[PDB]
RNA sequence: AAUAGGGAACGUGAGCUGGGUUUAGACCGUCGUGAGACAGGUUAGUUUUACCCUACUGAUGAUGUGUUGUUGCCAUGGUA
RNA sequence: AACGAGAUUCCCACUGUCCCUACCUACUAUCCAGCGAAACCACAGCCAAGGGAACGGGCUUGGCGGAAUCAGCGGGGAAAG
RNA sequence: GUGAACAGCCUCUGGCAUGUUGGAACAAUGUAGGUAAGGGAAGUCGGCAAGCCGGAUCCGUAACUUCGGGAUAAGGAUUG
RNA sequence: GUGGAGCCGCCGCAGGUGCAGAUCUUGGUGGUAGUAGCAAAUAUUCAAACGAGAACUUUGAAGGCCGAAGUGGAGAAGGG
RNA sequence: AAGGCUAAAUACCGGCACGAGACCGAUAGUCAACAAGUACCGUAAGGGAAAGUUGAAAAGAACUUUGAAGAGAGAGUUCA
């Protein structure tokens, strides 16, 4: 019910302006700009995808 | 435009300072005939064009 | 007797629209002395600008 | 759809102001100028319009350094300063 | 300033004038003709009843398409209209007329409006907006008015 | 006592003459 | 006058539009925008027999 | 009862309708090397203004009988 | 065959398209307060016949002709563009 | 909220003074919207415009076909 | 009559020497004319206030519409 | 001859200055006698105006009066 707007001066939903939204301690549902999703390293030498483990994606 | 290069808002700052009337003392000098500023720009009738 | 500045600023300190704000046409020149917001917050506590709450939209039917 | 409904899509500029003549004639897509023809070394003037020289010949502006060469001439360009 | 037909007896006659004021000219011409030769405290009570639509004003020369009304028959005419701005500027001037008559020491309840003429002022301009991208002008027509007030005695 | 302003030339754009061409097949 | 009135780019309007066939100046904007250009008839015009 | 012939700028478009004509699209036939053409056939195709004068339909009226009202006369016009 | 704001014919159903128009409402138009343009315009604007550039408003011979105007009208002004 | 729906329609949050003016009256012509007995294209170049049918469930669905279609063909019923 | 600083006869000379028309150029003004018009998106009403002045400004009360693909909230471009 | 220089006599609608005119005298003369290649138009090349005068001296109307003011009516300056 509480319509909420962008906070940065890019008014599109492009590849880098995509978010989540959270509620502050001042209980206004605000609009929070998130990082993109990391991807883990895939193995060398032609094995199936699904990336490595042990490392921080 | 809200995203203006610095050459523009030192071009706009000249065209704001001159949109301003004659002072009333200069219509009392010896030998003038200007009585109102005729280079006054109003922002709807006549636009700068950049 | 222009009250439109006081109508805007009270609606920016009640966190409401222009519709909701402001009862009490008695003290009307008195609130025309209130220009800063730290006079317009004293008038709420004194009871001269109230919230005038929401039109009821009962779902009982 | 030819006239006033299609003057609504005049939203983006083409000619901005040049740096050598200051004309609003610098064509951004071509990066040259309309009056002076900016990045070429000379100054674009033409004899097929005798008014377009009258706007920009010598003697239309300030002449910060020819109001003195005209003045310095009539004494033979001295360097010894003055008596006292 | 200078009037037309400066009055026959300047000792006992008041005068008044207003210039470059924005009324319509045609609505002012044909109401200054209705009171031309009217006693002042009857004309004052007249021009109230013009604005209240209780007593009309006939249009005589300037009546192109002006509709008909029933209060014109007091004047012997078949046309009329009730201009409550035209008859409200020169209602104000009768106040200006009687202000100069008491300053010259005259009984203001004994004056008539001897002379009155309405003539045109320089028309001020603006513009309208017509079909196919043309401009056609709005122009006003302000008026000059002028009255001499003489008693009959 | 404001100074005089505007009153610029109209400079109206030319439009089309005689509307529809019409004419006679004859 | 060395060259009076010809220092102006103008032409006849040509077609109808209920105007005389005198050359008219071009453009828009200013007052002198559609007026009658050169010719002995017109205001601001080259005189007949510009004297030599 | 009879389904007579006409005229009024081949009455009548600031009254309409746009079917056929009579622009630009297009197809077919014939002719032309060709562009194109054809009282040859076909489908698709922007119809502007009246607020001016007169005419006319109505509506107030003006003259003169001192002023105002009531009841009437009929010149002329139409006419089924 | 399917398809088409494609072109043509006919039927069933439906209806003011018609017989034959009628009534109602809305925004107007109309009257009023305030503001108030334009196109157009030799002079202007009553007809019949004759003559004439062979189809007059004006001339000729007749008919005749009372101020000022309001709402409508499309006959004319071989109207205006 | 209804409903299949971000359709349409009524409302809350949030807007707004009805779009460059107001008042009186309810003539014609108009512009936009409705109805109408009996007949049902007779109108008209042409069913132009308008109207009828229109949602769902359960039945029923032909000629023809490139076997995909046709098809929601048509044609009935039911609904609170 | 207005007006306040120049001007004319005769003899010669020299012309950018005379306007009613050019759908003439430029400036000015009329008849038209207080006329066409100020009619797309439903709609305003009462009192109080400041005011010389209130249908239109503000305030309140009431009746309204936009009705979450808004007559709402924020932007990019453009405007300065 | 297939190599070279060189003063005067000559040309000058750009400029820096000048002088004069059987010139034009604010719709003329340049486009410009004045804040003119300025206002303003066009995306841009480019197109591009209208516009002189109070008086000797501003002595440019203090003041009284009706109006909220625009504006008056008295008074005052000056030869007007
Ligand atoms: O607006 C016009 C329009 C109407 C008349 C004129 N004319 N004709 N002669 C004239 C003389 C002076 C002035 N104007 C004139 C010009 C244009 N339209 C239009 N109508 C019919 C034919 C051509 C057109 Cl373009 C549109 C078209 C689409 C539907 N709505 C109307
Ligand atoms: Mg009888
Ligand atoms: Mg002049
Ligand atoms: Zn440049």
Ligand 2 centroid to Cα of residue E20, in Å, is 62
Residues 6+ apart with CB under 8 A from E14: E97, E98, E100, E101, E104, E106, E111, E148, E149
Q: What's the gap between Cα E141 and its chain centre?
A: 14
E132: chain F residues, CB-CB within 8 Å: 15
Nearest nucleotide by C1' from F23 CA? H22
Residues 6+ apart with CB under 8 A from B12: B4
What pairing do the DSSP bridges indicate for beta strands E13-21 and E111-116?
A: unpaired
The phi, psi pair for E44, rounded to 5°, reads -65, -45
CA distances from D27 to D12, D19, D41 (A): 13, 12, 17
Whether G14 and chain F come into contact, CB under 8 Å, resolves to no
Distance CA A30, CA A23 (A): 6
Distance CA E108, CA E149 (A): 10
Whether B50 and chain D come into contact, CB under 8 Å, resolves to yes
CB contact under 8 A, F12 and E125: no
Distance CA A31, CA E30 (A): 71
Nearest to B15 by CA among B35, B38, B41, B37: B41
DSSP code, position E79 = -
Distance CA B45, CA F12 (A): 16
Distance CA E119, CA E116 (A): 10
Cα dihedral E44, E45, E50, E51 sign: positive
DSSP code, position E74 = G
Q: Do chains B and G have 3 or more beta-carbon pairs under 8 angstroms?
A: no
Distance CA E30, CA D26 (A): 64
DSSP secondary structure of E91-123 = HHHHHHHHHHHHHTT--GGGEEEEEE--EE-PP
CA distances from E84 to E41, E64, E89 (A): 19, 19, 9
Whether B18 and chain F come into contact, CB under 8 Å, resolves to no
By residue count, chain A amounts to 57
Nearest nucleotide by C1' from E68 CA? I70
Q: What's the gap between Cα C6 and its chain centre?
A: 8
Distance CA E101, CA E114 (A): 14
The phi, psi pair for C40, rounded to 5°, reads -85, -15
Residue of D nearest to B7 (CA): D17
E89: enclosing H helix or E strand: helix E86-103
Give exposure, E113-148, as e/b (b: 16+ Cβ within 10 Å): bbbbbbeebeeeeeeeeeeeeeeeeeeebbbbbbbb
What pairing do the DSSP bridges indicate for beta strands A29-32 and A20-23?
A: antiparallel
Ligand 3 centroid to Cα of residue B6, in Å, is 46
**Residues forming a β-bridge with E137:** E127
Q: What's the gap between Cα C61 and its chain centre?
A: 33
Q: How far apart are the first and last CA of chain B?
A: 11
| CA-only gyration radius of chain D, Å | 22
Residues 6+ apart with CB under 8 A from D26: D15, D16, D17, D18, D19, D32, D33, D34, D38
Q: What's the gap between Cα E38 and its chain centre?
A: 12
Give the distance, in angstroms, between residue E130 CA and nucleotide H57 C1': 35
Whether E125 and chain F come into contact, CB under 8 Å, resolves to yes
Distance CA G52, CA G38 (A): 18
Distance CA E92, CA E99 (A): 11
Distance CA E117, CA E143 (A): 10
Nearest to E6 by CA among E143, E146, E104: E146
Ligand 1 pocket by Cβ (under 6 Å): F 19-20
By residue count, chain F amounts to 26
C-beta separation of E75 from E60 below 8 A: no
Nearest to E109 by CA among E45, E18, E34: E45
Q: Using what technique was this structure determined?
A: cryo-EM
Distance CA D40, CA D23 (A): 16
Nearest to G4 by CA among G45, G37, G34: G45
Residues 6+ apart with CB under 8 A from D49: none
Angle between helices E86-103 and E25-32 (to 10 degrees): 50
Angle between helices E40-51 and E86-103 (to 10 degrees): 160
The phi, psi pair for D35, rounded to 5°, reads -90, -60
Nearest to E145 by CA among E25, E57, E43: E25
Nearest-10 Cα torsion for C15, C19, C25, C31: 40
Distance CA D79, CA D62 (A): 25
The phi, psi pair for G12, rounded to 5°, reads -70, 140
The phi, psi pair for B48, rounded to 5°, reads -70, -40
Distance CA A30, CA D24 (A): 44
3-state secondary structure of E26: helix
E51: enclosing H helix or E strand: helix E40-51
CB contact under 8 A, D17 and B49: no
3-state secondary structure of E49: helix
The phi, psi pair for E98, rounded to 5°, reads -75, -15
The phi, psi pair for E95, rounded to 5°, reads -65, -40
What pairing do the DSSP bridges indicate for beta strands E13-21 and D15-16?
A: unpaired
Q: Do chains A and E have 3 or more beta-carbon pairs under 8 angstroms?
A: no
What pairing do the DSSP bridges indicate for beta strands E111-116 and E143-151?
A: antiparallel
Nearest to D13 by CA among D23, D28, D34, D32: D28
Nearest to E31 by CA among E68, E61, E74: E61
What pairing do the DSSP bridges indicate for beta strands E143-151 and E13-21?
A: antiparallel
Give the distance, in angstroms, between residue E71 CA and nucleotide J74 C1': 76
């Amino acid at each position: 019910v509480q319509r909420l707007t962008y906070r940065r001066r890019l008014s599109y939903n492009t590849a880098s302006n995509k978010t989540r939204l959270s509620r502050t301690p001042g209980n206004r549902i605000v609009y929070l700009y998130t990082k993109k999703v990391g991807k883990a390293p895939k193995s060398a030498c032609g094995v199936c995808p699904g990336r490595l483990r042990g490392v921080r994606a | 435009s809200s995203h203006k290069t610095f050459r523009i808002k030192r071009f706009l700052a000249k065209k704001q300072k001159q949109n301003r009337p004659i002072p009333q003392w200069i219509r009392m000098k010896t030998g003038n005939k200007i009585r109102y500023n005729s280079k006054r720009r109003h922002w709807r009738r006549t636009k700068l064009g950049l | 007797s222009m009250l439109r500045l006081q109508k805007r600023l009270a609606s920016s300190v009640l966190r409401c629209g222009k519709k909701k704000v402001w009862l009490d046409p008695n003290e009307t020149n008195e609130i025309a002395n209130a220009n800063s917001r730290q006079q317009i917050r004293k008038l709420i506590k004194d009871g001269l600008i109230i919230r005038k709450p929401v039109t009821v939209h009962s779902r009982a039917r | 759809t030819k006239g006033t409904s299609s003057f609504g899509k005049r939203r983006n500029k083409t000619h901005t102001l040049c740096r050598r003549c200051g004309s609003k004639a610098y064509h951004l897509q071509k990066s040259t100028c309309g009056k002076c023809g900016y990045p070429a070394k000379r100054k674009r003037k033409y004899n097929w319009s005798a008014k377009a020289k009258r706007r920009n010949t010598t003697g239309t502006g300030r002449m910060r350094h020819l109001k003195i060469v005209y003045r310095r001439f009539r004494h033979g360009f001295r360097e010894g300063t003055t008596p006292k | 300033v200078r009037y037309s037909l400066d009055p026959e007896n300047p000792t006992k006659s008041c005068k008044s004038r207003g210039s470059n004021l924005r009324v319509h000219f045609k609505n002012t011409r044909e109401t200054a003709q209705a009171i031309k030769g009217m006693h002042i405290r009857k004309a004052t009570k007249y021009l109230k009843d013009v604005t209240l639509q209780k007593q009309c004003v006939p249009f005589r020369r300037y009546n192109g398409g002006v509709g008909r009304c029933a209060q014109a028959k007091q004047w012997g005419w078949t046309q009329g209209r009730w201009p409550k701005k035209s008859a409200e500027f020169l209602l104000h001037m009768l106040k200006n007329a009687e202000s100069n008559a008491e300053l010259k020491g005259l009984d203001v309840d004994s004056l008539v409006i001897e002379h009155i003429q309405v003539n045109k002022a320089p028309k001020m301009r603006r513009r309208t907006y017509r079909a196919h991208g043309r401009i056609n002008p709005y122009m006003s027509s302000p008026c000059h008015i002028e009255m001499i007030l003489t008693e009959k005695e | 006592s404001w100074w005089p302003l505007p009153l610029l030339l109209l400079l109206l754009l030319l439009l089309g003459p005689a509307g529809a061409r019409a004419q006679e097949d004859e | 006058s060395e060259l009076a009135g010809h220092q102006t780019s103008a032409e006849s309007w040509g077609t109808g539009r209920a105007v005389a066939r005198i050359p008219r100046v071009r453009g828009g904007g200013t007052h002198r925008s559609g007026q009658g250009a050169f010719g002995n008839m017109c205001r601001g015009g080259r005189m007949f027999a510009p004297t030599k």
